[PDB]
Design a protein around this ligand. Sequence first.
Ligand SMILES: C/C(=C\COP(=O)(O)OP(=O)(O)O)CO
Ligand SMILES: C/C(=C\COP(=O)(O)OP(=O)(O)O)CO
Ligand code: SF4
Ligand code: SF4
Lengths: 405, 405
Amino acid sequence: EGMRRPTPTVYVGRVPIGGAHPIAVQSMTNTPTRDVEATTAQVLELHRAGSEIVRLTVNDEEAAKAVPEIKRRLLAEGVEVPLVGDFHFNGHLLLRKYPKMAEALDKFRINPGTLGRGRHKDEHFAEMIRIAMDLGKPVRIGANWGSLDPALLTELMDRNASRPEPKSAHEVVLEALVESAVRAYEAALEMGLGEDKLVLSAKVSKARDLVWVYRELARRTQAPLHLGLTEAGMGVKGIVASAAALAPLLLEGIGDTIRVSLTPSPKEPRTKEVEVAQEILQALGLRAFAPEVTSCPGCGRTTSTFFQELAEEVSRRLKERLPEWRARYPGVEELKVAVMGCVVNGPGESKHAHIGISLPGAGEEPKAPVYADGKLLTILKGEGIAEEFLRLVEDYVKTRFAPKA
Amino acid sequence: EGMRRPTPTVYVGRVPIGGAHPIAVQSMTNTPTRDVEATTAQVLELHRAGSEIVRLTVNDEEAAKAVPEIKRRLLAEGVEVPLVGDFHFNGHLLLRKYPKMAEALDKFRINPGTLGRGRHKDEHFAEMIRIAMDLGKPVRIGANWGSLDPALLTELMDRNASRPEPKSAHEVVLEALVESAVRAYEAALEMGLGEDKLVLSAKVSKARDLVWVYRELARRTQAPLHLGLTEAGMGVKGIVASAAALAPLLLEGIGDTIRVSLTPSPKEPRTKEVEVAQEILQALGLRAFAPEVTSCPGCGRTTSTFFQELAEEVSRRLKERLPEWRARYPGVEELKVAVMGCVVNGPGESKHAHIGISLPGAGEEPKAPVYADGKLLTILKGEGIAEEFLRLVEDYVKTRFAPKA
Ligand SMILES: C/C(=C\COP(=O)(O)OP(=O)(O)O)CO
Ligand SMILES: C/C(=C\COP(=O)(O)OP(=O)(O)O)CO
Ligand code: SF4
Ligand code: SF4
């Protein structure tokens, strides 16, 4: 778009991850995995909302035993969404003990910071890779600075201490995180895990750090990169931090799949993080999921209640019509609609949309121009402007995005 | 931090804008400017929420007649927030006819696309600039692709047609927008408007485009830059788009004041855009407005309702106590609190905060280790871990951010 950083293709189930493929949205469940009903339902829900890949924790024996049945229930519904198993501390134990789960999973996640501490640490690593290789499973090697390999930090602390100009302890923590991921990645390649089976990540919780980190990742490896700002937080803060962190990197062509790590409000659904990941990619023109509305903030030049109501109804109708438009009209995901408050930027901004309307603001003739494909399509006056506009959009979508050839 | 693109300082009222100064948050009212009662109220509201400068439309005579009164009322409350006047089409008439309005304002906004169409557009431009200079008022020359100079687009469209390889119609639009701001900028300086009286913007409604644009503006001029994604839209979309548009630029050191162009929902207050502007800068470490919470998404390894509720309670308490902490504890705005769901990343991430808590996972003990200043502080057990942690948080602040000198 672009342009994309070159990487081999990693297939997570039927979903290809890589530089020649769309950046894939994924998310993670928060149901107890031992609860097959709750976990199956949420996987469905996340998949429904647009999660192309879904991760779940496989944290103990009960969780592992449920994974085949969850996978069974998804398949019985024709739901071929890929499951990634999240493993910490005991990943080698469960995968060994439970081969039906290892087989059920479509990808394993390994954290090089939660393997175990020492010389059995390598064995756990090697066991997990071996099982992936025997089954032909892809692996994510994912570092996270909340669980940084202490031995590596020490080693780089030692290294940095004797540089002619030592770097800051903070910069060294980052170095050590990158180094954890890269060295684990290179160890897996040395064991013979194919380039087409290995995804990397190395997450931190501050936007400025994360850009540093993934720039080094991209520089030092060829692997597709899983990008996210971990422990993003709640509400507006969590949404903003996630977007601000990922955007500079994505605009640089770094990132091949993303997850947004929002803390849900108790009154919020787990599908919200999917919404955010989608809006990030679409805002950067890197994906198109669903029609969008470009609207002005409204100011003293337009009637506030009228305007905000019109903008809200247009966005709700688009969302309403989307399930039908997907089936009927292929390509409708790229639809861009404008709703503007007055003649200052109304017409101009409307012409940058597929279709748009500007209301007459203060000082203006009581008319509301509608533009389509850059030129005046018609002029609305009177009551029922919202529904009139939405009829124009409906016909527009039918015409521009109709199936052809 | 950084580093900041160097610029002269432009004082908007008492608010300094420039490379040597904190990036200033601003906003814009949407009340009828002629409604003194409504508009004074909203300016206070926005200033209270943290808008350091507030813009209001001055679109007509009635609007103009109100601005001196609005300013009077703000000042009688000891509120010295700078007011920016947004002018289109008739700025020269209003500024000429209503000199007290000209004086009451703290800054004038000019749009080079809404001046008039041709050579009287220069006369309108010059009158406004001349008035600004006589009063020593700062000016923003703000271009917007929703009101792009049509003669300018034609010219560059024609010029581009004769390049050995013409650019797309889209890229030229961006070209013309830069050139509109750049040309108006050099025109105003040639008129003798001071470098310390000139701020620039050139806004588009698409992130990737906005990055290209402000990179060009930054390169071709020396002026402080007002940065924003115009017509950002509603809800999560508008929030994400604003964040993703501004972050790449701010991280590059481009941008000296920001505005977030959110379309409010009818049930949301005009202050949300200020909230978002705040979160953008604090996420990138550029400002510190208020304590923040770093929290995990939660997963199958912890109990959802408890974790999400506790995280919420922490964030609400921070918000509740800040007015008190603001007076008592200088610097508390930098406070970072972590709330984590389990032992995998809990301790690590917590040790990266000022104070944080690691909760007991689905592998259980109702007890939660608390970290402060990078090390283990204590271990809470039993019921009321939530309330006990928050008492620890209050005590932490009382000690860490205690009065000094
Ligand atoms: C579950 C977990 C961390 C946060 O979920 P995250 O998607 O923020 O990070 P990671 O899993 O490291 O990619 C364990 O590292
Ligand atoms: C009111 C207005 C535009 C939108 O408010 P904006 O702050 O999004 O854009 P601008 O004012 O052009 O910097 C007039 O261009
Ligand atoms: S389009 Fe008009 S009403 Fe909307 S923000 Fe711009 S000037 Fe104000
Ligand atoms: S800290 Fe624990 S509960 Fe939270 S997301 Fe990470 S692994 Fe899951």
